Amino acid sequence: DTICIGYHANNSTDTVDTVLEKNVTVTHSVNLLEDNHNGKLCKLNGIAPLQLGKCNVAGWLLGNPECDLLLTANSWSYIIETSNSENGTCYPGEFIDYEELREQLSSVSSFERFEIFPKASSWPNHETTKGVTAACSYFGASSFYRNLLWITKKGTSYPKLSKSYTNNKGKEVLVLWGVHHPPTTSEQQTLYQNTDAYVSVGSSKYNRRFTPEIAARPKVRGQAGRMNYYWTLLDQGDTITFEATGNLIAPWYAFALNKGSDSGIITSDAPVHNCDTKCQTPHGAINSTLPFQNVHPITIGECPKYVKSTKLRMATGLRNIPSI
Amino acid sequence: DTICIGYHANNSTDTVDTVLEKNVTVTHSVNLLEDNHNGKLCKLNGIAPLQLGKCNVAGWLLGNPECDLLLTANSWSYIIETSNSENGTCYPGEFIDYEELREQLSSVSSFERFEIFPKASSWPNHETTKGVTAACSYFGASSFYRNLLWITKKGTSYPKLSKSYTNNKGKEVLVLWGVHHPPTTSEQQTLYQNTDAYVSVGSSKYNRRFTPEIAARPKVRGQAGRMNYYWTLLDQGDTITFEATGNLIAPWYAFALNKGSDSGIITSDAPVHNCDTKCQTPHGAINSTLPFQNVHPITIGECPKYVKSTKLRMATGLRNIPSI
Amino acid sequence: DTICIGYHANNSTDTVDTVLEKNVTVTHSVNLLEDNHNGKLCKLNGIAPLQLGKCNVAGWLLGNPECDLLLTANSWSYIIETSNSENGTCYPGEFIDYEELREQLSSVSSFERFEIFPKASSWPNHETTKGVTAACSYFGASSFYRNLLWITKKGTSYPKLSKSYTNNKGKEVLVLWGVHHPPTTSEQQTLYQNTDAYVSVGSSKYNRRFTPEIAARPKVRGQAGRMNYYWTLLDQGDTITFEATGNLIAPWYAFALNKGSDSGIITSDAPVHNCDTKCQTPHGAINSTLPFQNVHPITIGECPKYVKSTKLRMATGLRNIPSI
Amino acid sequence: GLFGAMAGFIEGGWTGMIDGWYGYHHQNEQGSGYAADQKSTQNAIDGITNKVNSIIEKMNTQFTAVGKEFNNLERRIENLNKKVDDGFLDVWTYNAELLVLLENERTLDFHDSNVRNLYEKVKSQLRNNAKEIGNGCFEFYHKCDDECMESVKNGTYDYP
Amino acid sequence: GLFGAMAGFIEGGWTGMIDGWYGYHHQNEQGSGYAADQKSTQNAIDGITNKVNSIIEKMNTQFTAVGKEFNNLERRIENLNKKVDDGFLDVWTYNAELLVLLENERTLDFHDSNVRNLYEKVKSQLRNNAKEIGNGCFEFYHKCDDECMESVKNGTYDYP
Amino acid sequence: GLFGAMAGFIEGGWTGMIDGWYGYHHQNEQGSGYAADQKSTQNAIDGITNKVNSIIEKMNTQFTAVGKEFNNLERRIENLNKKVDDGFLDVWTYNAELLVLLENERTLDFHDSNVRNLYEKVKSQLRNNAKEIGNGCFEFYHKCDDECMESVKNGTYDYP
Numbered sequence A, B, C: 001d002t003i004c005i006g007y008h009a010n011n012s013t014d015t016v017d018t019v020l021e022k023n024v025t026v027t028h029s030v031n032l033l034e035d036n037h038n039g040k041l042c043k044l045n046g047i048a049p050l051q052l053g054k055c056n057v058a059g060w061l062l063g064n065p066e067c068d069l070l071l072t073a074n075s076w077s078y079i080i081e082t083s084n085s086e087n088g089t090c091y092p093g094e095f096i097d098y099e100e101l102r103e104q105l106s107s108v109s110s111f112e113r114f115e116i117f118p119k120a121s122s123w124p125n126h127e128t129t130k131g132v133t134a135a136c137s138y139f140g141a142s143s144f145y146r147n148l149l150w151i152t153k154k155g156t157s158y159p160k161l162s163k164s165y166t167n168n169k170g171k172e173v174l175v176l177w178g179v180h181h182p183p184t185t186s187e188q189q190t191l192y193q194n195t196d197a198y199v200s201v202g203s204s205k206y207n208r209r210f211t212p213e214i215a216a217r218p219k220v221r222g223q224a225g226r227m228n229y230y231w232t233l234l235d236q237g238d239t240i241t242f243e244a245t246g247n248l249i250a251p252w253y254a255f256a257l258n259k260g261s262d263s264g265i266i267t268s269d270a271p272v273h274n275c276d277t278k279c280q281t282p283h284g285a286i287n288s289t290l291p292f293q294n295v296h297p298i299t300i301g302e303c304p305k306y307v308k309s310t311k312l313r314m315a316t317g318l319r320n321i322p323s324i
Numbered sequence D, E, F: 001g002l003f004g005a006m007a008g009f010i011e012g013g014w015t016g017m018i019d020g021w022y023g024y025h026h027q028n029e030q031g032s033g034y035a036a037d038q039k040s041t042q043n044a045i046d047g048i049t050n051k052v053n054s055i056i057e058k059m060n061t062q063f064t065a066v067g068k069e070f071n072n073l074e075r076r077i078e079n080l081n082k083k084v085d086d087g088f089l090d091v092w093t094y095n096a097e098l099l100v101l102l103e104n105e106r107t108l109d110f111h112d113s114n115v116r117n118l119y120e121k122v123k124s125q126l127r128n129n130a131k132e133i134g135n136g137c138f139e140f141y142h143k144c145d146d147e148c149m150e151s152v153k154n155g156t157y158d159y160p
């Protein structure tokens, strides 16, 4: 009569590495490395993202003629740009503090697009119907941004304009605009006459002034002229005044929004579906259960610390030594 | 006759957590989490801080009429702003590189306030007694910053001024100044005549020039005009030259200081006492003995690494299993 | 007859520290702290660095008369400045975005210096032989930067110039230039006549314009005038246009380079030899075998994590308890 | 292992024992078979379970957006951002890698220790009434029926 | 514990022993009582003391001002600053949390190991001259007065 | 140590044994001498070797240029860069320092454990045929020639 004390064994093939020895076959293990995803762009915390498709942030906000589906944009928890996101500033120029704007508009609660300065009578004694370029073509036709208005000259007179707007939207307003910079002084005058013009934007929290910086420069996608784009967040109850003698690509539409926090811009060509997720990446949604992940260094949300590891398997059972 | 070998036990209730089991009652433990403070703002390393009270850094340095007690400021290891720190730029405008200045003036050894450009005869043939606004009211009366001088016009003439100062203080000098930006050109001329004025500050290490940026903008705490504040650290033996045809809010007083290192600005309404400390936080002084703390993410000095933990208790004794 | 089971011992003096006890003498140990170097500046990954010696980056790129040996610079994996690196902008002024340029030119594959705008006929009806200052003396003689050209006035006429350059180098081109800022308006006109001049640099990716900022300021190493230096990376196939009515220190030579990655600037007076290394520091080359190092916080390449430790010795053998 | 029981003086595992991690195997005139020790197995599970939880539960993460976007004239802060990303991702790689390696060594030892304490728990009761065969087995110097086999399992083996 | 002594084969602690961590309790015709083993207790203290010191002493910190201040047009570097703060404060939270958990497991085992080595230190001397009662107790097959009780404590127990 | 063998019940090391870490020393009418146990020594080496490798191999580092260069109007990001550098260099200092301290404790215990398992490996075979002298030595109750001494070393000691 004998009794033996021993331990369990099974058909397990799981192997873990230990301080003293590699690939030790163990009976039971748990994985601590999330390395699989769903190749889908999900809703981050129950709030789908914003797809820009062929357009990029600049094209979307400015009103590039190719981003018309984006004129209804609403909610979104993070912005998605594609490898096709190329419709931006159809008219050459620097989008001032662009990175900064992209970063701040990452996450938005509400976002209403309203006509801040109506084209139809808002610019008396000023040409508001010529501001159309070929660089910004809309179906073969020459067009322009849908949120900005290119104010040209009335016949042969360009008087000093001065429109103010006070944000009574009960939330912040994103006002965008531009300053045109003719190549010479022949265009400078043929468009705004006053060869010495200026544009000044004033707010209780803003005051930078401008003057066209005419100069010779290479034509880009058509024009040798240039348009710098400027934006600003107008606090509630504050007033922003615009006034110029020329070179002002005035705001037509502004956005009334409610920023809650800030995420980022996922740029991937992966499909967007009605799935959810606490952590999102370019290749797809990641699980937020394990303490580490190796799917992508760039992630948005509450994510597992990214690591270069390929295997982080933890033993739970004992060494496996079968054979009967 | 028997002898037994065993272990100690007592009335201890201390509980620690282990990899395999939670709340294990142990006979002796040590705490590794500093989670208590003294609700007091102490002297960081034997050098009391600087209280600004109702004022903020900008108001203190510029000479806001409400920060008169601060005209004697001396030493300080870190600056304290209160939830009441609101007396700053009583006259609307941007304080250029403000964050930067706040950061650099965090810690100061010596700091003498001297009259760099005396009001009384320093600006010949220039009005030096009108530069008083209502936005900067001193006891119902209209006043102005005490360290800056608003040079207006002499009768109906505003000639080109040009004062230089060479730092022979044997240390750095903090020179502050401002450029006024009238709303239109009626004020622009009624004050500095020359509707085309300019202000230029020159140093062996500085040269930015200025021109009033008149433009329509919302009135702030009174005026629609604007004043940008600029500062600069003038090295020993260097000379700073000022000269303008208008719109210059000239330096009246500058500060001769000796920066040793740099700390920060604690902003809290907690009481200040003659206590000491190696690590200071907004809620109070923290102990620098334990390796971790959870009193506040924001701290100044040699501090314990901040953690989200609430309990980091280490066992020193053995499990406690009494019962006789 | 007896048999005893025991353990090894030897004449070892190696001591390690353990959680429970310090300086435990062990029979065998391994060091995990790389704390020795070779007091030599080696080739980082088989590509020697670039020594600037008496010159600094600004002097090297601008063409300071004292950096003539650097006119052949080629390859380099990191830049070496010495405690003697002081020949930079011999003519006073701000080198715009200098830090940024230093950082971007840290590592370069190819780098050909070519004459972008030849002095000899390139500036018709413009004085191209007076642009020589004493601040930039070449062997007692008055000279100037070798890569920039000081275009002055032809007799008593300074017409509007306009030269463009299109990068067909099949790689990026580093174009450097400058804008002169006279102290007054007597020099402003005696040199460029047009007291109202301007300089404009245009590219499909650049457009900042300039106007001399004449103003009184302290003379530096000679002149009270000032020269701001600007650079730009001109993409392949892009065109950069220059045109001005004065105050333009035009590009004479530009650099055609091929950036692969980016390292940094080691600043040390240590000797440079034909040795190699995966990790380089100011005091010398470090070994990249151990997981930690304490030779210097500042390193370039794949390096061992820097630590404040002086001893990180790991036991491999057992405690040493000899005595026979 | 560290306690000599696993793949040590009890060099093999029991495919036959399927109801627990550590346990017994008896053989008497009445029959044979395995019986996992439920207590030490349960306790081991609770511990390993609690251990995995800690390694996962203690990992705090707030809502973050790693990416940044810097323009061609912001290479320095872009490289600083890089340094931060590579920095943390170097700390978490070395840490995670070793946390596992080290904790794996600890879990196997733990199991080994549990087996050795069980084998020792039994050696204690049997004393003189059984002979040790260096393989984790005991051979009763007497007859031990199923009740007797049971008794030692539930730690109540008589006069030794 | 890991060495079966604590809350193991010596399932209880001695409230009575008040002069040390590990020790003895005797009972002979002359009287009874506890006596902590001074050596192993001292050594244990030195070790635990030295251990706590390391965990505290090895924590280097330089004079730092964590806070920063960035204006509304510096959201990106402000978020980078954030990433750094959350980053380190995530590393130190996970690390500290586990350093304790892991070191606590190690300190208890350590104590357990000390008790088992003491009990074993004694089992050695007594050999045949005492019978083991599975509770950390030895019953001398002979009479053992106070000097004899002392002898085993100071490790000098005679012919076994 | 933690397993009582090193500087414990076998308080001294053998300068004489020069072919391994753990081993034997015999003394019989035919002569005496040392013989390191090759298996446990080899295995110990493989383990310590593999262990040092892990601590070194698991340290990932990419090509980085630590230094930065910020001008007098960039003190804030310069201090942020500082915070990052001091930050990581505080994490790696505390970590490296403790990784060693902790792993050193583990390596010594490991050795101690190896010695105790060897001494125990032998106590097993000899059983009744030898008497234990509390010093890691066994005294055969019989005569044990070189072949017999060998037999116990290569674990094949006869009827005990």
Ligand SMILES: *[C@H]1O[C@H](CO)[C@@H](O[C@H]2O[C@H](CO)[C@@H](O)[C@H](O)[C@H]2NC(C)=O)[C@H](O)[C@H]1NC(C)=O
Pocket: A064, A065, A066, A086, A087, A088, A089, A090, A135, A136, A137, A221
């Ligand atoms: C927006 O982006 C598209 C896609 O880049 C622009 O079209 C470009 O690419 C087309 C090839 O797919 C070609 O038409 C041209 O290479 C180029 N556009 C031109 C100059 O025709 C498109 O023009 C952009 N739309 C606007 C107006 O912004």
Ligand SMILES: *[C@H]1O[C@H](CO)[C@@H](O[C@H]2O[C@H](CO)[C@@H](O)[C@H](O)[C@H]2NC(C)=O)[C@H](O)[C@H]1NC(C)=O
Pocket: B064, B065, B066, B086, B087, B088, B089, B090, B135, B136, B137, B221
């Ligand atoms: C400095 O700050 C105070 C406090 O904010 C200014 O007073 C403001 O608040 C007062 C209520 O406590 C009211 O008087 C006003 O809301 C406001 N000041 C005005 C417009 O009267 C105070 O004016 C400031 N002092 C200066 C001149 O800087």
Ligand SMILES: *[C@H]1O[C@H](CO)[C@@H](O[C@H]2O[C@H](CO)[C@@H](O)[C@H](O)[C@H]2NC(C)=O)[C@H](O)[C@H]1NC(C)=O
Pocket: C064, C065, C066, C086, C087, C088, C089, C090, C135, C136, C137, C221
């Ligand atoms: C480049 O640097 C040198 C060294 O600093 C300049 O010489 C300076 O130092 C010399 C002493 O070693 C002295 O000659 C002067 O202090 C100073 N130069 C002057 C004003 O003569 C040298 O001039 C510089 N060369 C140029 C033209 O850039």
Ligand SMILES: *[C@@H]1O[C@H](CO)[C@@H](O)[C@H](O)[C@H]1NC(C)=O
Pocket: A010, A011, A012
């Ligand atoms: C392994 O054994 C399990 C029984 O626990 C069984 O369900 C499974 O199908 C087996 N698979 C293999 C690898 O044979």
Ligand SMILES: *[C@@H]1O[C@H](CO)[C@@H](O)[C@H](O)[C@H]1NC(C)=O
Pocket: A015, A022, A023
């Ligand atoms: C373990 O051995 C090596 C590492 O030592 C590894 O590459 C391999 O995948 C493992 N082999 C198996 C299948 O156990």
Ligand SMILES: *[C@@H]1O[C@H](CO)[C@@H](O)[C@H](O)[C@H]1NC(C)=O
Pocket: B010, B011, B012
């Ligand atoms: C606990 O016991 C100690 C004796 O060490 C005594 O001083 C203290 O008052 C007691 N407190 C409690 C909780 O009973």
Ligand SMILES: *[C@@H]1O[C@H](CO)[C@@H](O)[C@H](O)[C@H]1NC(C)=O
Pocket: B015, B022, B023
């Ligand atoms: C331990 O149990 C839980 C965690 O397991 C904890 O919330 C509680 O405070 C502790 N209970 C006590 C008093 O031991």
Ligand SMILES: *[C@@H]1O[C@H](CO)[C@@H](O)[C@H](O)[C@H]1NC(C)=O
Pocket: C010, C011, C012
């Ligand atoms: C130590 O002993 C070794 C033998 O392994 C010998 O080679 C060396 O010279 C000795 N050195 C000392 C310190 O005596």
Ligand SMILES: *[C@@H]1O[C@H](CO)[C@@H](O)[C@H](O)[C@H]1NC(C)=O
Pocket: C015, C022, C023
């Ligand atoms: C160990 O003792 C102290 C630290 O405890 C250390 O300063 C010294 O160098 C060491 N002494 C020696 C030589 O063992």
